[PDB]
Design a protein around this ligand. Structure first.
Ligand SMILES: Cn1cc(-c2cccc(N3CCCC3=O)c2)c2ccccc2c1=O
Length: 127
C-alpha cells in the first residue's frame, strides 16, 4: 500500500544524446499528449496512497507516467527515441493491465494512445 520511489530521471553516468527524433518526441509527442483534456491522471506517478490503490504497485512493477517522461526529455536522459517510445508504451500498457476494460481511466489512455500512434507514425528520419 505505500508508494515506491519514482522512476529514475537523472543518472550522470548514463550516456545521453539529443537526436532530432528525441526533439520531436518532446516538441510534438509529449506536448500534444500533455495538453490533452485526459492527460491529468498521467502527468505524474500514480499516488497509490492518495488514490487508495493499495494493490497498484503489487501488480505494476514497471511504473511510468508522463511527468517522468517529461523530465527525462527535458533533462536529456535518453540515448535514442526507442527508449522514450517504450516509456509511453509502458505507461499505456500499465493502465490496461491494472484497470478494467471500459473504465474511465482506460478510455482516457486509449484517447492519448491514439494521438501517440498518429504522431509516432510520422517520426522523422534520424538526422
Ligand atoms: C494511471 N492511473 C492513474 C490514476 C489516477 C487518476 C486520477 C488521479 C491520479 N493522481 C492525481 C495525482 C496523483 C495521482 O495518482 C491518478 C488511476 C486512478 C484509479 C485507478 C487507476 C489509475 C491509473 O491507472
Amino acid at each position: 500500500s505505500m508508494n515506491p520511489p519514482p522512476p529514475e530521471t537523472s543518472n550522470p553516468n548514463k550516456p545521453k544524446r539529443q537526436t532530432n527524433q528525441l526533439q520531436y518526441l518532446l516538441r510534438v509527442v509529449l506536448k500534444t499528449l500533455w495538453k490533452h483534456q485526459f492527460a491529468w491522471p498521467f502527468q505524474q506517478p500514480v499516488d497509490a496512497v492518495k488514490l487508495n490503490l493499495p494493490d497498484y504497485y503489487k501488480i505494476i512493477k514497471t511504473p511510468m507516467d508522463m511527468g517522468t517522461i517529461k523530465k527525462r526529455l527535458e533533462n536529456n536522459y535518453y540515448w535514442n527515441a526507442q527508449e522514450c517510445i517504450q516509456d509511453f508504451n509502458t505507461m499505456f500498457t500499465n493502465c490496461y493491465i491494472y484497470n478494467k476494460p471500459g473504465d474511465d481511466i482506460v478510455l482516457m489512455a486509449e484517447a492519448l494512445e491514439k494521438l501517440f500512434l498518429q504522431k509516432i507514425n510520422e517520426l522523422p528520419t534520424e538526422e
